[PDB]
């Protein structure tokens, strides 16, 4: 029964990820909200707050949203493969078979249970050969979360904030004396999506790689 | 008027320190004013390294901490050289023609920062390990 539910979750992931990519491609040349989309290319910020609002209307943004769904999909795939094989390698297949049919089992007997040693790679009493993976695990969480900053907060807040920094630099003696060659400006609209997603996805993979390797190497 | 007028703005107890620092002083050449900036900055940069370092109860903590301090001056000698190549591309003129506005003496500033920086790092090494 556990394998049944997950296979439809994986199916859900493959269909939804394809949906985002297919709708983005088929509407790339144009839609009702933007009939001449093809004239602006693959990647452009939007088309302003008019016509109701047009954020994330470019074909590039569709790929961008789909990167969140693939990670989720490949995550559910790798989460499943790891937990199932974990029982199989320990010869105690009963844990997966009974706990995987409800999500609290995936939260208590998979993530929380197998993170016991990893999270103890170093502590107030010492450190073991898993301190690297434990540091990387925390490292991954921080850069994952750092991506949320670019994805939730947009250009305008930052551009106005940067202006006060430009003012402050120019009016402070012993620092005024030196100058930038390139005028400081906030990251672009498209740039931020890319920078946020890159942090998110580097963090997504680096966190899981640290856990996967350390959890399995600890018990074998 | 463009600039705001606070009662503590344009105060001579504050503006007098600016016109007599070795960055705005009138008589200094770029070799002299870079020697004075480096002698002050190198003197306190060996401060944090010798009592906050990876090795502090050693032979050893004062020598290696002072070695890290001249390590920053030769790094900031490169940044002062990198800022000079970028911001003075042919020593781009301007309205005021200071050392910092158009360069025109900038290679003497970066060299003077290195002598006064690495000297006062080594001078403060004499005052902690000896004296």
């Amino acid at each position: 029964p556990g394998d049944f539910l997950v296979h439809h979750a994986i199916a859900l992931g493959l269909h939804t990820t394809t949906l985002i990519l297919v709708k983005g491609a088929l509407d790339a040349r144009g839609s009702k909200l933007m009939p001449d989309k093809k004239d602006f290319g693959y990647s452009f910020p939007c088309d302003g707050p008019g016509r109701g609002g047009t954020c994330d209307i470019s074909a590039w943004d569709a790929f961008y949203l789909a990167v969140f769904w693939m990670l989720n999909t490949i995550g559910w795939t790798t989460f499943y493969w790891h937990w199932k094989h974990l029982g199989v390698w320990q010869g105690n297949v009963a844990q997966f078979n009974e706990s995987s049919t409800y999500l609290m089992g995936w939260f208590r007997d998979y993530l929380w249970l197998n993170s016991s040693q990893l999270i103890n790679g170093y502590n107030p009493f010492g450190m073991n050969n898993l301190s690297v993976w434990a540091w990387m695990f925390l490292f991954g969480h921080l850069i994952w979360a750092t991506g949320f900053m670019f994805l939730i907060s947009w250009r305008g807040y930052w551009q106005e904030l940067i202006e006060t920094l430009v003012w402050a630099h120019e009016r402070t003696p012993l620092a005024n004396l030196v100058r930038w060659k390139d005028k400081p400006v906030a990251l672009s609209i498209v740039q931020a999506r890319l920078v946020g997603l890159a942090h998110f996805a580097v963090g997504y993979i680096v966190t899981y790689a640290a856990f996967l390797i350390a959890s399995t190497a600890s018990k074998f | 008027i463009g600039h705001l007028s606070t009662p503590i703005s344009n105060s001579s107890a504050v503006n007098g320190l600016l016109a007599n620092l070795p960055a705005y002083r009138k008589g200094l050449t770029p070799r002299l004013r870079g020697l004075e900036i480096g002698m002050a900055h190198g003197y306190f940069l060996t401060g944090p390294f010798v009592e906050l370092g990876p090795l502090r109860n050693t032979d050893g903590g004062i020598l290696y901490g002072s070695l890290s301090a001249v390590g920053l001056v030769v790094i900031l000698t490169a940044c002062l050289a990198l800022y000079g190549k970028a911001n003075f591309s042919g020593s781009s003129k301007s309205k005021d023609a200071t050392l910092w506005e158009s360069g025109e003496g900038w290679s003497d500033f970066v060299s003077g920062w290195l002598i006064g920086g690495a000297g006062s790092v080594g001078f403060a090494y004499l005052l902690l390990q000896y004296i």
């Binding site: 390139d182 | 790094i75 490169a78 990198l82 190549k85 970028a86 911001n87 591309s89």
Partner: peptide, 30 residues
């Protein structure tokens, strides 16, 4: 032994050189 020499070169010295090489290349002009 050769690890002790090489990992501060490409860890500290060589990134300081290529960042110096790329920074002058960016801010040059015709």
């Amino acid at each position: 032994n050769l690890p002790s020499i090489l990992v501060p070169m490409v860890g500290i010295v060589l990134p300081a050189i290529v960042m110096a090489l790329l920074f002058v290349y960016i801010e040059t002009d015709e």
